[PDB]
DNA sequence: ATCGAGAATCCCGGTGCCGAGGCCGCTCAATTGGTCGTAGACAGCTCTAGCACCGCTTAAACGCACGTACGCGCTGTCCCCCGCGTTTTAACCGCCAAGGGGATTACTCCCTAGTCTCCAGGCACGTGTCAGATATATACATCCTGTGCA
DNA sequence: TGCACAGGATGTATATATCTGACACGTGCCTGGAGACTAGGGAGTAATCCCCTTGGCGGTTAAAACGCGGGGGACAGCGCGTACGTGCGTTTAAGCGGTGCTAGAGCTGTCTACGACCAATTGAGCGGCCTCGGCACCGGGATTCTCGAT
């Protein structure tokens, strides 16, 4: 039939269990969300890409998304993404 | 086949009211209606540019919602809840 | 033949795909290499946003007496914090509505 | 005796208190999408709409005129006054950009 | 138009009409360089009321169909017949204009009614219409003047020429006009009281190079004394025994129409 | 070989077509480019620097100069709306803002209003 | 007329009435290009305020410059609008809460 | 050592072209070779959305054409529309 | 480099503010205006120095230079030429 | 400054019901393993600006006196907007066709990416020159004040 | 007390003359764009397929429109006090020119390790399908502001 299509639904599913075990999400809130969640990627994508073309560098690293990230999100926000962010670097590199 | 013409008037002066009693506004001055409309088909004009720009960019003939998205995001008035 | 093939998502401890985000990575024209921590590294901070938000959404939504969350909580919460007000700054949320707010000098005096 | 009657001013604050609250559209449904239909005739002829193209038109329009709206109570707020007028609507979007 | 007039007239004595009339076409002859000045009094023959003026009390509708006067007539054809070096009006009438005078000739210092100028590259426009804009503002048309290599047009509002008290004066006009005067051989003024300036002092500035100065009004100019001859009659029939005693007579005023430049050398006896 | 000919000089255009299509294939902006992208761009390019460039140079002379500096810039960019428009949010540096006074700020009524000096 | 044409017909040095060396100021910064803001004060500025997110930095003399020129762009347009507020309520004396309003309305506060 | 492009001869050709007396300073040049690359990258970025947005990944004439009438208003747009046919087709037609 | 802070906001003199108002247009000044622009200026330099300082610190020099501070201010949807490029 | 009618709002408990949430089969995208060639990490130099300090000149910031123009508070009025009835007006809801057009495959061909050579357009650099700033030197249109007459 | 001039005083305009540092221009390299040539896959047609847009009809009321009486608030005057602009004498530190030192910004080599790429493998994830309860409405009373007496 029709073409698959790409969604954020079961993973922000996943988190909201993680959060708050028994409430729900309607349909409406899910694509608001799954909105938000390709909003934030895009502008975080666009400034490491921009982060990598200044320094005449070819590659998207880590830390480029750490610089694009604190360059972003605001005070707390910054600190505790970057917090969980090397958090997540650290444990990837470790158990591989 | 189908010309409209007196569709600006459609939004009448009990919608703009309440759209103003849920900006906040206790007391409504009586010439505010107009003004309302005027910048109200300019905003509508300024987008509907862009979405069918973006429609006919495409070869296509009918107006999908992720074109309206695409120029709302353009104009730095991002919009959620419609895909995209 | 292999081994038991864990995802790359279960290896860093997160819950979002650190694979589809790396191919969206690749597949989108950013750079012309990709990074191998750059994926991990996105995803972790994707999901850190996406807690908080739910977060304080289900927070309103036990404060408004329901268990189920609709775009009006989340509008609640994106607008009650100024974190998430100042991030999402001009970004307007369908069916969302507004804050309830009244300026002090349209309220009746004399009492 | 007289009639009960409220006070000019009670009934627009419940007016404030009940829209406030609420999330659904203000505008009517049928004359902004001939509205839109209008507008869209001057740019190509024989155009087709989809029904979640005017509901995001409508979405946008509405929170557009609400946030004019705060801006513009606010402008009258600071001129002594509680009423707003169109010089307020046009002071608001001269600071704001659109001149 | 209301409490009363406070202005004395004497007319002249019919007499001493042909007598400075003959002896003002005298100086008419061996004069090589003749600078005219024109006033409001001018028109009065057309009927075209509206400063002292204004003090005693817009007439638009009687502005577009406006018939220029028989002196106005009778200066065209001075042009067109040579001996006529230039012309300065502080009219707003616009009648010179549309008599056929060349505009290269006239210095319309007060500006006209009927003409729109840009305000990005300062180019004239010469409309039928009547302009509705009084005070140096908009008009609502915009510049067409083209550019090349396909780029925009000028598209500037376009302004009108009607001044202001207190207003800055058109350079292009006010230099022709100072040029002019000091390139002045006789200076012949016409119905106007010679009291707004700095277009009032134009004249003087004719003997003060040694020069001649000829004043015709019926009523009194602050600048009577410094002279060579005062006139006092009505400019209606002056200019009758004025063209009679050179010759000639008006063509036409075969309705509105504009001259840009003039017309090589003289036709007719100079 | 060939006369080599340089691609701006075939479409009839001052600014570089080569440079344009290099910079195209080199910024990330898609997989592979077409072959009359670079040309029109091109054209675009050199179409909007001399609308500003000659409105820069109509400001100069303007003011008794045969040179065009960042002012004259700045007055040609402010006094036009759509080239203001298109460059809404940009600060010229040495440019310095258009001559502007609110008419209410003007002392005014010292002036004969003409009502036969009472 | 080579001077004041125009058109018409007609104690100590009177100290000026309050309000016209102000628009002789305004006409004379308007016309003007150069910058407005003493340079070592505000490197000085620059540099405390830099001193506080990582020590012991170094600065081009075009930061410096550039960022001298964006602050007092950005200070003229809010002056602007500031004096725009101030006569939308009937004066002529601009107020910190013209300031408040027009940095409210634009979207900072 | 390094040479560094910049849009600056192709600018005093154009100002020669369309004022033959007039010159322009460094500052000047400077802010008008500023003004070029910002246009080229906003025009870039446009078209370069535009086709992802129609899962294509050529940037061909029209991309450009459609990002153009995006970005600039009104007349600009349609003289820059103009002038970039008029490029093509000569470009097309001379071989 | 020794010297570390002083009271350096009193840099911006108060002539400096009316030289800026009246380039802005502003024809009567109040007296709390000088104490609230000086508290402007600095949050919007400290808005635009830690961006450029971000851009320092990621190409691992210890120099800000005139691209970082033209694009931390591009960043902030306000560009300028006349420095960079 | 206090009571009491009255319209409006908030619990209370039924009740359908349509949408949120769980299960299952299966294409398809993520994973594992190996090869490789280049992007970038790491040293090492060169020298270019960045920083520190000193004198001198003077433009500007500063402190103070003073007067007037402007901001703020009252006061009156009259006019424009709000609240409540009553009547039209048209939006909204179900239901039904009839296509017009957006999606989906198959196929082919022409358009664009690699690569390879080479030579001329474009950049770095040195130079004479000319536009923009300052500084007198005549020329002229107004404007102000002193010395005789009805 | 009000004219009538004459001549000195005031501000503006045009014309030369000198200076100086940035600019237009000529020259020598050099590496990047142009001309040939080939391979492969991206996209342009062509043909179905179904789905979702548009147009129509009809009953029901929700809401808009119109009318009318008050009332309160927007606007125009007055009046007063103070604070802000203006001018002048002090001072003070900015701006410039100069000297000196060195931190690190660019650039060049060398090597290695790390992503790109290509085949097999397989299980997380999507579409389709059921199924039950969170929730939006139904009134009925119970509070709860609100505004007029008193």
Not at chain 3, 6 to 14: E, F, M, V, Y
Not at chain 5, 153 to 163: M, W, Y
Not at chain 5, 209 to 221: A, D, E, K, W, Y
Request: net charge positive; proline share 4%; charged share 30%.
């Amino acid at each position: 039939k029709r073409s698959r299509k790409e969604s954020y639904s079961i993973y922000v599913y996943k988190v909201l269990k993680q959060v708050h075990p028994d409430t729900g999400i309607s349909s409406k809130a899910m694509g608001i969300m799954n909105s938000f969640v390709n909003d934030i990627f895009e502008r975080i994508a666009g400034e490491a890409s921009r982060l990598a073309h200044y320094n005449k560098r070819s590659t998207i690293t880590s830390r480029e998304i750490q610089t694009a990230v604190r360059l972003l999100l605001p005070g707390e926000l910054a600190k505790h993404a970057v917090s969980e962010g090397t958090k997540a670097v650290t444990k990837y590199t470790s158990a591989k | 086949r189908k010309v409209l013409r007196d569709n600006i008037q459609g939004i009448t002066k009990p919608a703009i009211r309440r759209l103003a009693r849920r900006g906040g506004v206790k007391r409504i001055s009586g010439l505010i209606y107009e003004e309302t409309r005027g910048v109200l088909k300019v905003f509508l004009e300024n987008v509907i540019r862009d979405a069918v720009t973006y429609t006919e960019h495409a070869k296509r003939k009918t107006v999908t919602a992720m074109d309206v998205v695409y120029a709302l995001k353009r104009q730095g008035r991002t919009l959620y809840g419609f895909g995209g | 033949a292999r081994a038991k093939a864990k995802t790359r998502s279960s290896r860093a401890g997160l819950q979002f795909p650190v694979g589809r985000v790396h191919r969206l990575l690749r597949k989108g024209n950013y750079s012309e290499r990709v990074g191998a921590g750059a994926p991990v590294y996105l995803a972790a901070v994707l999901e850190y946003l996406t807690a908080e938000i739910l977060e304080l959404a289900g927070n309103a939504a036990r404060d408004n007496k329901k268990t189920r969350i609709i775009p009006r909580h989340l509008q609640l919460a994106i607008r009650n914090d100024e974190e998430l007000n100042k991030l999402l700054g001009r970004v307007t949320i369908a069916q969302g509505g507004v804050l309830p707010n009244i300026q002090a000098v349209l309220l009746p005096k004399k009492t | 005796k007289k009639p009960h009657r409220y006070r000019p001013g009670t009934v627009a604050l419940r007016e404030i208190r009940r829209y406030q609250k609420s999330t659904e559209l203000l505008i009517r449904k049928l004359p902004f999408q001939r509205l839109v239909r209008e507008i869209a005739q001057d740019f190509k002829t024989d155009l087709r709409f989809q029904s979640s193209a005017v509901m995001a038109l409508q979405e946008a329009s509405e929170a557009y005129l609400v946030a004019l709206f705060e801006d513009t109570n606010l402008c009258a707020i600071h001129a002594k006054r509680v009423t707003i007028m169109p010089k307020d609507i046009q002071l608001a979007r001269r600071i704001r950009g659109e001149r | 138009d209301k409490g009363k007039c406070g202005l004395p007239e004497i007319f002249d004595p019919p007499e001493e009409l042909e007598r400075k009339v003959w002896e003002l076409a005298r100086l008419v002859w061996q004069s090589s360089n003749v600078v005219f000045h024109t006033g409001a009094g001018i028109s009065t023959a057309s009927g075209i009321p509206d400063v002292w003026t204004m003090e005693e009390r817009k007439f638009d509708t009687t502005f577009e169909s406006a018939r220029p006067t028989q002196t106005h007539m009778a200066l065209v054809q001075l042009e067109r017949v040579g001996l006529l070096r230039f012309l300065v009006s502080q009219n707003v009438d616009g009648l010179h204009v549309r008599s056929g005078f060349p505009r290269d000739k006239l210095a319309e210092l007060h500006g006209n009614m009927f003409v729109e100028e840009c305000a990005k590259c300062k180019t004239q426009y010469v409309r039928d219409t009547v302009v509705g804009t009084m005070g140096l503002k908009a008009t609502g048309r915009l510049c067409t003047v083209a550019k090349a290599r396909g780029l925009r047009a000028c598209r500037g509002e376009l302004r009108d020429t009607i001044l202001d008290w207190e207003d800055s004066l058109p350079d292009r006009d006010l230099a022709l006009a100072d040029e002019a005067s000091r390139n002045a051989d006789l200076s012949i003024t016409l119905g106007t009281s010679l009291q707004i300036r700095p277009s009032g002092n134009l004249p003087l500035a004719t003997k003060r190079r040694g020069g001649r100065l000829v004043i015709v009004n019926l009523q009194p100019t602050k600048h009577d004394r410094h002279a060579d001859l005062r006139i006092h009659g009505y400019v209606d029939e002056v200019m009758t025994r004025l063209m009679k005693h050179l010759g000639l007579e008006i063509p036409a005023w075969d309705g509105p129409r504009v001259l840009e430049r003039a017309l090589p050398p003289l036709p007719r006896p100079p």
